[PDB]
Write a protein that binds this ligand. Structure first.
Ligand code: HEM
Lengths: 143, 140
């Protein structure tokens, strides 16, 4: 149901632009349930993340590599599913999936439930990954 | 040469190593020098005994380099720029030594993580270590 494996197959986002408008670099950490480094996500998600400002809510962009293996990728804000959408995709050998989602003001950490699968083998689930920004996010309408 | 499947296995395998990367790096070196004594020529003024402070220290620096290579696997040559100049231009290390190091590293990973070290992951790690060896042994 809307996995990154199948989402990136849309040729409309073969190399679509996604760097227009105001943004700020924001560092973060990807931790597991024990507040220790979630390594697979640490290698996969680019740090720092770009946070694009809008009129309503700030939209954080996450650069996910090896998208062809990434199956499930759900982001939650205070145990509420955020609307994630694929904005652009770099083809192989780069294989980077750029996805965006809105975050309310003051939100410093998010919950990431995700999974990976190679072609059609063992589905490796990652039940809890904890994305924690170095500072809380705040949208700026004045830019 | 490195497929999406290979890159996935490298992250997962090196991820499950995680905190013990520096320990296996040091172990791989001690396993290399004892097995292949010709490798010692590149480290003349070094303490190459069992449980040496220099070997443990150097093993951490190798593990951190591998972790850096795994994190930036999509752009290794740019990630390992300084190390390529160091090994290729300055030190002029023979590429054969890298095959001996990776041989010892894969054996170490197999010992400490037997169930996780599947033939598919074993293939990807060797393929990953080969590509990192070509970057370091090549001149730019
Ligand atoms: C897995 C592949 C390898 C990696 C990732 C790697 C990484 C590194 C790094 C990060 C350093 C810098 C240490 C420092 O700052 O002091 C270094 C130094 C060095 N490496 Fe390697 N290396 C690899 C393979 C080899 C091989 C095969 C040899 C030859 C047997 C070799 C010989 C040396 C020497 C002689 C130094 C300088 C030692 C010093 O004076 O500090 N390396 N290596």
């Amino acid at each position: 149901d809307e996995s990154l494996k199948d989402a990136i197959k849309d040729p409309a986002l073969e190399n679509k632009e996604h760097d227009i408008g105001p943004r700020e670099q924001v560092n973060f950490q990807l931790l597991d349930k024990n507040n220790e480094t979630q390594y697979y996500h640490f290698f996969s998600i680019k740090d720092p993340a770009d946070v694009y400002y809008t009129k309503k809510k700030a939209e954080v962009e996450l650069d996910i590599n090896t998208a062809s293996t990434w199956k499930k990728f759900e982001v939650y804000e205070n145990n509420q599913k955020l609307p994630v959408r694929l904005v652009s995709y770099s083809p192989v050998p780069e294989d980077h999936a750029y996805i965006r989602f809105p975050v309310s003001d003051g939100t410093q950490e998010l919950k990431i439930v995700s999974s990976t699968q190679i072609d059609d083998g063992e589905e490796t689930n990652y039940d809890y990954t904890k994305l924690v920004f170095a500072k809380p996010i705040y949208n700026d309408p004045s830019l | 040469v490195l497929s999406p499947a290979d890159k996935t296995n490298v992250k997962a395998a090196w991820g499950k190593v995680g905190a013990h990367a520096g320990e296996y790096g040091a172990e791989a070196l001690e396993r290399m020098f004892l097995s292949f004594p010709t490798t010692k020529t590149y480290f003349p003024h070094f303490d190459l005994s069992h449980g040496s402070a220099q070997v443990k220290g150097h093993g951490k620096k190798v593990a951190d380099a591998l972790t850096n290579a795994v994190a930036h696997v999509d752009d290794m040559p740019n990630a390992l720029s300084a190390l390529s100049d160091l090994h290729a231009h300055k030190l002029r290390v023979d590429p054969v030594n890298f095959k001996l190091l990776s041989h010892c590293l894969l054996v170490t990973l197999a010992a400490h993580l037997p169930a996780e070290f599947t033939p598919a992951v074993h293939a990807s790690l060797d393929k990953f270590l080969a590509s990192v060896s070509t970057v370091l042994t090549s001149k730019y």
